[PDB]
Symmetry: C3
Subunit: 119 residues, 3 copies
């Protein structure tokens, strides 16, 4: 019935996206490209775009975002990219905290909750 | 069915976001106070404000994530928290140590709630 | 009554599990047994199994998991336990970040969101 789960980008460890009754949970997305906070933030947001598309959602349908930075010194730099990317008038619940990530060179990780668009 | 309402929207985030009975609040950070207890009170008072605005309250919080700058403030935060929570209807909770956007912020609380029917 | 809340393992501070409209929110599960990351992860995951079962769910119906490690040096050791525990083909959205926990001896805390299986 309506609690049925769908899985996207499944690995032995995690799925990139998981969806159930209209809600969408993305794995924490980490940089695949870039060195600077801005470069890495851009790459992470592009991944999010790609995975939200796969789930029948998009950034204008993000409910919540938690942003983990390795170093809170990168706040303004991250924000500059985030601010340009978010859907205006439809910006999500957000929290930003300092936490070290699985690799030392990762400066940002963003964890998204979103909703599947109604047809 | 999956329609979204945004509350207190800024260019960067909204304070509250509702979809299909669920409410997601932004991390609420202190606007008043210096000590962990004073800041926890202020954070919780904001949560109350945004909850009420969204047709919810503290007795309909599902989940709370508490970030402290310093886990040494654990007892101090809890004292304020324990007094505030709706008795018999206390949420899923996790409390972890993480630094916040401003150095003087000792506490940030992130809430998921339900809109009362 | 569509959004009725059910509470499980309610203390004056928190409930171990909270359910509403099919979704399950577990409190951060912390180790009650074990010293090493491996030992503590298993204990944490054993708790999760228990509470998910109490809420009419299981590990194959976990939507999301946030894993906090005291020390990111424990990443491989935790993943070892995680990888064997997770339901193959049904692995959840995951994020792993470094954060100190309530007690210094605690090396892992896992926070789960899941769905109540249909009848």
């Amino acid at each position: 019935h309506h609690m049925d789960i769908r899985y996207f980008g499944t690995t032995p460890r995690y799925s990139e996206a998981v969806g159930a009754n209209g809600l969408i949970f993305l794995s924490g997305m980490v940089p695949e490209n870039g060195e600077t906070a801005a470069e890495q933030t851009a790459d992470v947001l592009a991944q999010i775009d790609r995975w939200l598309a796969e789930c029948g959602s998009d950034k204008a349908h993000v409910l919540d975002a938690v942003i983990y930075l390795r170093d809170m010194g990168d706040y303004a730099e991250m924000n500059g990219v985030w601010d340009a990317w978010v859907a205006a008038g439809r910006t999500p619940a957000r929290a930003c905290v300092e936490a070290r990530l699985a690799r030392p060179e990762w400066r940002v990780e963003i964890k998204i909750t979103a909703v599947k668009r109604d047809a």
